[PDB]
From Swiss-Prot, chain B:
Pathway: Metabolic intermediate biosynthesis; chorismate biosynthesis; chorismate from D-erythrose 4-phosphate and phosphoenolpyruvate: step 4/7. Coiled coil: none annotated. One of its GO terms (molecular function) is shikimate 3-dehydrogenase (NAD+) activity. NAD(+) binds at A132, G133, G134, A135, N155, R156, R157, D158, K205, C232, V233, Y234, N235, G255. Changing S67A: Reduces activity towards quinate about 6-fold, but has a little effect on shikimate conversion. InterPro entries: Aminoacid_DH-like_N_sf, NAD(P)-bd_dom_sf, Quinate/Shikimate_DH, SDH_C, Shikimate_DH-bd_N, Shikimate_DH_fam. It is an enzyme of class 1 (oxidoreductase). It comes from the Bacteria. This is Quinate/shikimate dehydrogenase. The actual biological function of YdiB remains unclear, nor is it known whether 3-dehydroshikimate or quinate represents the natural substrate. Catalyzes the reversible NAD-dependent reduction of both 3-dehydroshikimate (DHSA) and 3-dehydroquinate to yield shikimate (SA) and quinate, respectively. It can use both NAD or NADP for catalysis, however it has higher catalytic efficiency with NAD. GO terms for biological process: amino acid biosynthetic process; aromatic amino acid family biosynthetic process; chorismate biosynthetic process; shikimate metabolic process.
Amino acid sequence: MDVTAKYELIGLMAYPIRHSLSPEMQNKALEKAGLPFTYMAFEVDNDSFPGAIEGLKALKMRGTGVSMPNKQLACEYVDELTPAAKLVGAINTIVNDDGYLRGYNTDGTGHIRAIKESGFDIKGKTMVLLGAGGASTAIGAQGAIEGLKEIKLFNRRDEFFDKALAFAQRVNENTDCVVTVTDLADQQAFAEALASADILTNGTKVGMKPLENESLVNDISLLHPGLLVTECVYNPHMTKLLQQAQQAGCKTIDGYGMLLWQGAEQFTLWTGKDFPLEYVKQVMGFGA
Amino acid sequence: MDVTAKYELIGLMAYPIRHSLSPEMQNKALEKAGLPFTYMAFEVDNDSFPGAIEGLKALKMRGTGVSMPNKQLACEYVDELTPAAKLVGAINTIVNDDGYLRGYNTDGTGHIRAIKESGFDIKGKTMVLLGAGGASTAIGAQGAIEGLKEIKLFNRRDEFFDKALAFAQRVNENTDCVVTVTDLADQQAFAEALASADILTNGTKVGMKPLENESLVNDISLLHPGLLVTECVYNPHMTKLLQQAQQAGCKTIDGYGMLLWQGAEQFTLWTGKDFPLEYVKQVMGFG
Ligand SMILES: NC(=O)c1ccc[n+]([C@@H]2O[C@H](COP(=O)([O-])OP(=O)(O)OC[C@H]3O[C@@H](n4cnc5c(N)ncnc54)[C@H](O)[C@@H]3O)[C@@H](O)[C@H]2O)c1
Ligand SMILES: NC(=O)c1ccc[n+]([C@@H]2O[C@H](COP(=O)([O-])OP(=O)(O)OC[C@H]3O[C@@H](n4cnc5c(N)ncnc54)[C@H](O)[C@@H]3O)[C@@H](O)[C@H]2O)c1
């Protein structure tokens, strides 16, 4: 890349982040399209976040990605939030449209976009959502807003159970999608849920390093063919869940899929251009 | 350049700016040394400057360059200024050291460096400074600090005249150099100086488009060989001042040399490294 006075800046505000891959990925996509943008990472926490936004505006940055621990706080500094973001209550993308700041959660749109790109239609379907954190909430919010008939959220009795309930409330009160929350301990309600589910989505940490050798699904007999299973965990690339999904004839979507489309969604929001997904997938070494 | 999450930001706050060459020049130099920094220009004016400084600190930028029209205002937003910066009253460089901002004016140090680099010792010498703008003021303050004998400043009857007056006072009260503000209209008193001068420095817009074929020097007469003629205008690389210069046999220092050294200084202030000046010169075609 050759940066000149013409280039505008796109940030990523989080902490820690100096070891983030996003900058390399977006800058590779940007250079490929020969666009006058540069994507950079800045160490920002809740204390400096306010001033960083003030910077975003004064310096006229095109926008910035947002990650831990500013995801929720960020909602307070934009001028407008999308419906899905309002349900999630957290954003990972900000777009500065000439001083007017728009907040987005591309984790939700990217996951669903990955689904649709596979030829799958979520309209009127049923999803078994594992989790209630940022990934799950974002997936579910977007999913509801895109047509899901019902979401059967399952979450253990931890610090996320109450968030689940509220999420269920917000979604039910502002969408035509019906959301229910069930304790992941009620193994009976789970099996039946999965049997009636068109999509099984894992938004939990389960399956991710170092606790890779584990899956929230007891036995492969719980899954059925035709069923679509999506994994948020992309580390390992092949979780246990995804491994079982194959041993059941289930179609699937891995973590890299959500990652690339999540990044593609931001790319388009900032440049208005399509994402060179294939190229980026290849250059970042995700194909193997 | 391959920007990653490890690169730190170095900006340029000014407006207009999207057509500046500092970015490429600084980014060519940085990539040349494989340094984890990226120089970027931001369209910022007096109104956005306060917010821009908040970003500089909050985003933890390594620093930023400052140009029109934020040079003067920038002094009010730093924690510490250099003696020259205080005399000049404006800065073009800001360095952020873990939250503390230091202001510098490399225009002066840069122009003086170019002088010294040609084998000239400004100490105890007389200079005829044309203009009182950002350039002239920077060169003068720095030149004074570095031993200049006296500064005979010449500026027309515009708003800068008063600026010249105020500038003369500041220097004459904090340096051993003696400055005098003379009306560029007194064509007579201009000879009395240009005659007994060691160096003639132009920091006015004359010489630069749309004032190309113009010069504050009526006849080659007033100028002879050996005389040092420094030109700040670099737009028309060969200003009418140079024509008369490289025709009267007076060694000169074009705006390219000043530009390169003023940039070298900022580079080093930010990265702590030596500026690949020769490399940049060639790549930027300044050669
Ligand atoms: N592919 C992508 O682009 C992408 C994007 C975002 C997050 N992720 C991944 O998704 C996962 C979730 O991230 P998050 O931000 O939503 O996390 P979070 O901490 O906000 O949520 C963790 C969730 O998982 C559940 N959970 C964790 N351990 C559990 C266990 N042992 N048993 C039952 N439930 C458990 C919790 O109840 C909670 O709802 C992470 O592995 C993350 O790396 C991937
Ligand atoms: N070498 C470098 O890196 C460098 C740095 C800064 C400025 N410059 C150049 O130097 C010039 C001056 O820049 P500045 O920032 O000092 O400008 P400024 O606006 O601050 O000052 C303009 C000066 O020129 C004088 N002037 C303008 N028209 C005049 C005229 N017709 N007759 C007599 N005097 C006249 C004014 O009195 C004033 O003192 C510009 O052309 C600029 O491109 C070069």
